[PDB]
Short mmCIF file of N, CA and C in Angstrom, two decimals:
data_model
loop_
_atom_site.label_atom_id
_atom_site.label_comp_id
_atom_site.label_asym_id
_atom_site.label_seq_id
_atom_site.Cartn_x
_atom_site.Cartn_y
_atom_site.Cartn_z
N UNK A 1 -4.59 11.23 2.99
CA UNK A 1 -4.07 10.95 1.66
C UNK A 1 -3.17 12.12 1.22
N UNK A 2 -3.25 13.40 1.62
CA UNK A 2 -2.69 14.65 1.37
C UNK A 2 -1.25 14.34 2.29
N UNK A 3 -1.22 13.10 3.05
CA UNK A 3 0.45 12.66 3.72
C UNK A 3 0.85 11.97 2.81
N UNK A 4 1.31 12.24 1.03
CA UNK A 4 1.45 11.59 -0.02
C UNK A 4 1.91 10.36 0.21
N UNK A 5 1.96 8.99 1.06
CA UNK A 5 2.09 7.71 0.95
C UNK A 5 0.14 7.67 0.46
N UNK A 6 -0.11 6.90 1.79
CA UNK A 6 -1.50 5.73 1.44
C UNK A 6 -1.98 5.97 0.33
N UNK A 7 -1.65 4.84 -0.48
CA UNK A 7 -1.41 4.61 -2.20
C UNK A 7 -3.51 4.56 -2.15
N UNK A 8 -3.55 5.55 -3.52
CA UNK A 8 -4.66 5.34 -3.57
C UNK A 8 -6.25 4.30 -3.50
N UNK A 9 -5.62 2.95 -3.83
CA UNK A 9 -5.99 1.73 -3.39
C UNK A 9 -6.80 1.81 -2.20
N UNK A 10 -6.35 2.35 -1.23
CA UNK A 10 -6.77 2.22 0.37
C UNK A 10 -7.74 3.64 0.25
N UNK A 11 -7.38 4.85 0.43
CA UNK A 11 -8.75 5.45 0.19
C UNK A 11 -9.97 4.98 -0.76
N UNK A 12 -9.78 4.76 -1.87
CA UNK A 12 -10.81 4.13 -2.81
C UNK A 12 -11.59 3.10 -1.83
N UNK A 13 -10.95 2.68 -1.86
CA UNK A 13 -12.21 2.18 -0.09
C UNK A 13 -13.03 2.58 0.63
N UNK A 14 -12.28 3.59 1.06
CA UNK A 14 -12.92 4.52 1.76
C UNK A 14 -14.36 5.14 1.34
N UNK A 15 -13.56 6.00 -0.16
CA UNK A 15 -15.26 6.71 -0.83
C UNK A 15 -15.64 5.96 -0.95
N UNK A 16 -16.03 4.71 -1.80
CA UNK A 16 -17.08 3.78 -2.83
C UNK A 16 -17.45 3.13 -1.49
N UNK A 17 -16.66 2.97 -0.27
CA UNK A 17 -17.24 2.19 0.73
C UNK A 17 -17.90 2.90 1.60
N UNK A 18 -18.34 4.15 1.08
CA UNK A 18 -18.77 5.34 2.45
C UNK A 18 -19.84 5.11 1.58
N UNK A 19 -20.05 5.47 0.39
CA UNK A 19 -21.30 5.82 0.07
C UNK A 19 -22.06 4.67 -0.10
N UNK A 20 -21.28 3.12 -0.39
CA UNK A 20 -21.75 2.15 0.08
C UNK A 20 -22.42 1.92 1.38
N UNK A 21 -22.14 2.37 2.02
CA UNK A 21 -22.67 1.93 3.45
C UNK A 21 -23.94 3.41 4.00
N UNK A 22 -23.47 4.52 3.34
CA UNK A 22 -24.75 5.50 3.30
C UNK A 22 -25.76 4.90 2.65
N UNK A 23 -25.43 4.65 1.40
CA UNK A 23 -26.57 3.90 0.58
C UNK A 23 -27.63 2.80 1.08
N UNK A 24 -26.77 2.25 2.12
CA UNK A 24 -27.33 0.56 2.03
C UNK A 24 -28.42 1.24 3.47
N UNK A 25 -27.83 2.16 3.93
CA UNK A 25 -28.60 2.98 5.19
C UNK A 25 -29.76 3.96 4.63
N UNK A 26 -30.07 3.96 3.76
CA UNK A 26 -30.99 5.05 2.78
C UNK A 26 -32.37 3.42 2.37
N UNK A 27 -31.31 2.56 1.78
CA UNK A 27 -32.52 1.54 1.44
C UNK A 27 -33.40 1.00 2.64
N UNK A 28 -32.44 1.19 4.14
CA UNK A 28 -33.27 0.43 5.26
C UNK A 28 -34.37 1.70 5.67
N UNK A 29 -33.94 2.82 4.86
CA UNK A 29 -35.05 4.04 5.05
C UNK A 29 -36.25 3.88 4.45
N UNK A 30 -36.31 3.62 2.90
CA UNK A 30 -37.21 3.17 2.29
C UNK A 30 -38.07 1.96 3.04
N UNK A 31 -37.28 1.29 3.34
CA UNK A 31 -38.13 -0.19 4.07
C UNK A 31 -39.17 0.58 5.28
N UNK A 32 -38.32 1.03 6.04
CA UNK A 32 -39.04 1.49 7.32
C UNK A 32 -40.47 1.90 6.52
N UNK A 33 -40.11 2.87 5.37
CA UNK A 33 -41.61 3.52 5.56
C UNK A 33 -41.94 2.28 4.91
N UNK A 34 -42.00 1.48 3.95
CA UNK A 34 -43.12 0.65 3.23
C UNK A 34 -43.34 -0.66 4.52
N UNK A 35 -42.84 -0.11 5.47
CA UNK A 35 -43.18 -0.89 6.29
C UNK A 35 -43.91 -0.22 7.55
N UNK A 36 -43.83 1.19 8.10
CA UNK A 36 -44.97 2.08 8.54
C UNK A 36 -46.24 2.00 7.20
N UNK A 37 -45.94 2.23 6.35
CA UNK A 37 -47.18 2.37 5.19
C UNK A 37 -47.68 1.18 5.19
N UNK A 38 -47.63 0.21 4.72
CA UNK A 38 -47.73 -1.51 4.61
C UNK A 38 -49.09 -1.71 6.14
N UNK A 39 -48.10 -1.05 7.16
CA UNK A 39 -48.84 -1.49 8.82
C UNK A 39 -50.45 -0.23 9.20
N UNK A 40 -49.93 0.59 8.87
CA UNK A 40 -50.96 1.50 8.73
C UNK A 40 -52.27 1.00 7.58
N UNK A 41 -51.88 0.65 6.19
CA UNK A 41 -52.89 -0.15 5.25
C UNK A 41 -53.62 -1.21 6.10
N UNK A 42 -52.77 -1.98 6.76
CA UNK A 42 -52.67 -3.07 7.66
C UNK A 42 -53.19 -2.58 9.36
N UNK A 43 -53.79 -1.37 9.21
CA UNK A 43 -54.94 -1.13 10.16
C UNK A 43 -56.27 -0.67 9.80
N UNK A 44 -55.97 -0.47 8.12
CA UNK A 44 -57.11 0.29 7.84
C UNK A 44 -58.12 -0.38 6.64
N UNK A 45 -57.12 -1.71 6.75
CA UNK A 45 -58.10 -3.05 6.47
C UNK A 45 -59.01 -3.74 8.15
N UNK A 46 -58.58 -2.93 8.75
CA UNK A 46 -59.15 -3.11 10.20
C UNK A 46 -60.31 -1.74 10.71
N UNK A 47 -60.91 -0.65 9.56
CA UNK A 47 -61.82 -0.44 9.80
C UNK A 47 -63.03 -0.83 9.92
N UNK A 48 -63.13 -2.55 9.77
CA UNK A 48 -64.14 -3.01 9.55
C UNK A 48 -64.32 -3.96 10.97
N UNK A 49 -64.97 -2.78 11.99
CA UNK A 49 -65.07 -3.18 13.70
C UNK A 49 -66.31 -2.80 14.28
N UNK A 50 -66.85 -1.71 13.50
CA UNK A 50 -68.20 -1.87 13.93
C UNK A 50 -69.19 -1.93 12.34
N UNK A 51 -68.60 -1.66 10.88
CA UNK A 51 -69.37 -0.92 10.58
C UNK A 51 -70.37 -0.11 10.66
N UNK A 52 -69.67 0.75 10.87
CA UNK A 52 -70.30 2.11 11.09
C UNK A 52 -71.75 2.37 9.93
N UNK A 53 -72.89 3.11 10.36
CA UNK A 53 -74.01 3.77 10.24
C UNK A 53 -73.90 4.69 9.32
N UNK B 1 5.35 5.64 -9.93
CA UNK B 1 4.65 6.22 -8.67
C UNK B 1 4.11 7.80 -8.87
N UNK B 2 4.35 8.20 -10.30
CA UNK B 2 3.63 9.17 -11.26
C UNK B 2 2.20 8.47 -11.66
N UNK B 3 1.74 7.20 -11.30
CA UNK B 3 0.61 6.76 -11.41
C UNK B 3 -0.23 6.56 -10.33
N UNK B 4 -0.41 7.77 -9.63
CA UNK B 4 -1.40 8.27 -8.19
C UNK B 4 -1.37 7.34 -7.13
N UNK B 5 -1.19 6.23 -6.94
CA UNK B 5 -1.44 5.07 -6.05
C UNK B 5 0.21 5.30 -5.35
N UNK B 6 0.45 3.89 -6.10
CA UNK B 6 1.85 3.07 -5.39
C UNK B 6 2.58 3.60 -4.15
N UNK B 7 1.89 3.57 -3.06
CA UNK B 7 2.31 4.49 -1.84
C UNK B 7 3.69 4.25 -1.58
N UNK B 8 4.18 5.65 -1.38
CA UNK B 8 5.51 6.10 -1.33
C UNK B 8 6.33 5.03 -0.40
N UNK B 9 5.95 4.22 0.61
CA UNK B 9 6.17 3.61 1.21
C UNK B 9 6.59 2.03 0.47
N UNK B 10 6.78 2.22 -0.70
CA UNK B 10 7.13 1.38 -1.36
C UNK B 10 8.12 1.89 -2.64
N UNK B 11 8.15 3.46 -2.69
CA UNK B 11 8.81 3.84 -3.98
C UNK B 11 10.04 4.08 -3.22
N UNK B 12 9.93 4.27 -1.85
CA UNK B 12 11.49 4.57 -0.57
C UNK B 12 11.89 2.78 -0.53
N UNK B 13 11.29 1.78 -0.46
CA UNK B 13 12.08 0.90 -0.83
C UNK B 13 12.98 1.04 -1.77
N UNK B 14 12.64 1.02 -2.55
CA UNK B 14 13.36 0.92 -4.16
C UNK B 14 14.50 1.92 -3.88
N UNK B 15 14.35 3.15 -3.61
CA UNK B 15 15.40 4.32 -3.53
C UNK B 15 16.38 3.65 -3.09
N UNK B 16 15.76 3.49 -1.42
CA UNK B 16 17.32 3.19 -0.30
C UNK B 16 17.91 1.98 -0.58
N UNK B 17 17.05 0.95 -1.36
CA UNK B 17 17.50 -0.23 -1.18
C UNK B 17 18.46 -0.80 -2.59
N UNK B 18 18.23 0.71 -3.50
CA UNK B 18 19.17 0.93 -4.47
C UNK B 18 20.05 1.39 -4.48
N UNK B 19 20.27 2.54 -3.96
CA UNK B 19 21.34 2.61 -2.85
C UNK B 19 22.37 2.22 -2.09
N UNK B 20 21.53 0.85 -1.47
CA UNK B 20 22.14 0.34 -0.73
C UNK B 20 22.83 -0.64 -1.65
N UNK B 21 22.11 -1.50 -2.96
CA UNK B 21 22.63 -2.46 -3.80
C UNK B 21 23.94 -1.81 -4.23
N UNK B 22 23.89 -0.38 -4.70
CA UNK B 22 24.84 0.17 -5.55
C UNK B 22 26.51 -0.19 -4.19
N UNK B 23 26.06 0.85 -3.36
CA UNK B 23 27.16 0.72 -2.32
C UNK B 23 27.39 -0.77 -1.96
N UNK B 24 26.66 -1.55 -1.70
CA UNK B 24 27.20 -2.83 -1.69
C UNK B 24 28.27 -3.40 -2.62
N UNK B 25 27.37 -3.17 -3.69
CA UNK B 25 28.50 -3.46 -4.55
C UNK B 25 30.03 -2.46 -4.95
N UNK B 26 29.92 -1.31 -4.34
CA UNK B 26 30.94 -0.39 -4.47
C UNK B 26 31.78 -1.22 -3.04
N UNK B 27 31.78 -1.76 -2.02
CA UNK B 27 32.20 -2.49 -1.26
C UNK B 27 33.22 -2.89 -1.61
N UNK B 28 32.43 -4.38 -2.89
CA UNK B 28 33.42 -5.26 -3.13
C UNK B 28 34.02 -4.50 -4.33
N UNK B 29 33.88 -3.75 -4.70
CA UNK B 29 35.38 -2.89 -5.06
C UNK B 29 36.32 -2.89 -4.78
N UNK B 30 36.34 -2.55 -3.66
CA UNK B 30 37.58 -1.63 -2.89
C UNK B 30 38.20 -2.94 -2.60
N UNK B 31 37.13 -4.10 -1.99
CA UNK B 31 37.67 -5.08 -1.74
C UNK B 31 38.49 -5.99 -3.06
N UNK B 32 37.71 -5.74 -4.16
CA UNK B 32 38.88 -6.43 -5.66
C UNK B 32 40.19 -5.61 -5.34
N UNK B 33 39.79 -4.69 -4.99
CA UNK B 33 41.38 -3.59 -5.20
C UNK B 33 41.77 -4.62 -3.53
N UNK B 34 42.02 -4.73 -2.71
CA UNK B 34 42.67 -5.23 -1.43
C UNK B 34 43.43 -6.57 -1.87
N UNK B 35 42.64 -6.99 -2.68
CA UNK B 35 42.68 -8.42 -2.90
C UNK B 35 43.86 -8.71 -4.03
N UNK B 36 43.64 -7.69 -4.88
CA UNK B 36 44.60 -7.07 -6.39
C UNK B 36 45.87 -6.52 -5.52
N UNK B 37 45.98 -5.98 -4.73
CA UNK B 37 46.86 -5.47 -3.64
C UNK B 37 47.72 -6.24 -3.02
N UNK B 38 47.13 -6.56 -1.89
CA UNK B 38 47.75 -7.61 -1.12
C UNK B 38 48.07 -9.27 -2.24
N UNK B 39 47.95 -9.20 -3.14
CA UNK B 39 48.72 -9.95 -4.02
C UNK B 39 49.57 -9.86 -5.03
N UNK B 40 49.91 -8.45 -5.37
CA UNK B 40 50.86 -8.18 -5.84
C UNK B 40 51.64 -8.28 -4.70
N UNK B 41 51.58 -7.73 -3.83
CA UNK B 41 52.52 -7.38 -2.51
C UNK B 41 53.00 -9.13 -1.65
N UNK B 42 51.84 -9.79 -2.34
CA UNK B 42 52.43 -11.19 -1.89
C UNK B 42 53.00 -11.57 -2.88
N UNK B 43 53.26 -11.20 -4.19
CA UNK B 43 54.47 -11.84 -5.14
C UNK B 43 55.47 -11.10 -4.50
N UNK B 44 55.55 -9.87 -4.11
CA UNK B 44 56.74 -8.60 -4.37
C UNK B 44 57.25 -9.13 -2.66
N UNK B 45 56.60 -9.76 -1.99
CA UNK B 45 57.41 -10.63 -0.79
C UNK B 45 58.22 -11.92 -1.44
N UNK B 46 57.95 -12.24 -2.74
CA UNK B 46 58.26 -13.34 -3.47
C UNK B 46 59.36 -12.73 -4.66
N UNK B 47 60.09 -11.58 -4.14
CA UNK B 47 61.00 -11.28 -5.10
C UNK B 47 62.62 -12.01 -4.98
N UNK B 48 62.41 -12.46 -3.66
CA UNK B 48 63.52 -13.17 -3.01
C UNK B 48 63.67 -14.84 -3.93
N UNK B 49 63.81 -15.13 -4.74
CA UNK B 49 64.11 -16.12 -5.82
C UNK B 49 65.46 -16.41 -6.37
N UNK B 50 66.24 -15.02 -6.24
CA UNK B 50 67.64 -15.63 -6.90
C UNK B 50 68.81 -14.77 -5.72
N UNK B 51 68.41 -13.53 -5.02
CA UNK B 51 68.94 -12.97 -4.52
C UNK B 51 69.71 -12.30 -5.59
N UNK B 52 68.92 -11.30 -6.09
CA UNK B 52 70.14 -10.63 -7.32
C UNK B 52 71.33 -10.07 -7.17
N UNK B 53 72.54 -10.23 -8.05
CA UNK B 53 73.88 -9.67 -7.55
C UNK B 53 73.20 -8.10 -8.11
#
């Protein structure tokens, strides 16, 4: 953009679409864990194998 | 194109192609003058009418 043509239009893309696409990569972060957390809960509704003494 | 965007690649249209309108039309100038020219010069071949004494 500092090669003063590509009219601002076309970078603006760029940022709002970078952090768009960081972002949307941050929410599949969140998932992962409530989905390690979720599976782990989801073993430990599975302590119930011998009841234990 | 003082309004951050409108990539230059469109404000060099306008320049050269104003430019180019202007000289175009400076063209047919020269050409009114040829035309203004070569017709006086086609009456002044047309002075031959009485053969003046």
């Amino acid at each position: 953009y500092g090669q003063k043509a590509t009219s601002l239009d076309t970078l603006n893309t760029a940022k709002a679409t970078l952090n768009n696409a960081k972002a949307e990569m941050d929410v599949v972060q969140e998932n992962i864990k409530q989905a390690e957390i979720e599976v782990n809960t989801a073993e430990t509704n599975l302590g119930y194998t011998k009841i234990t003494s």
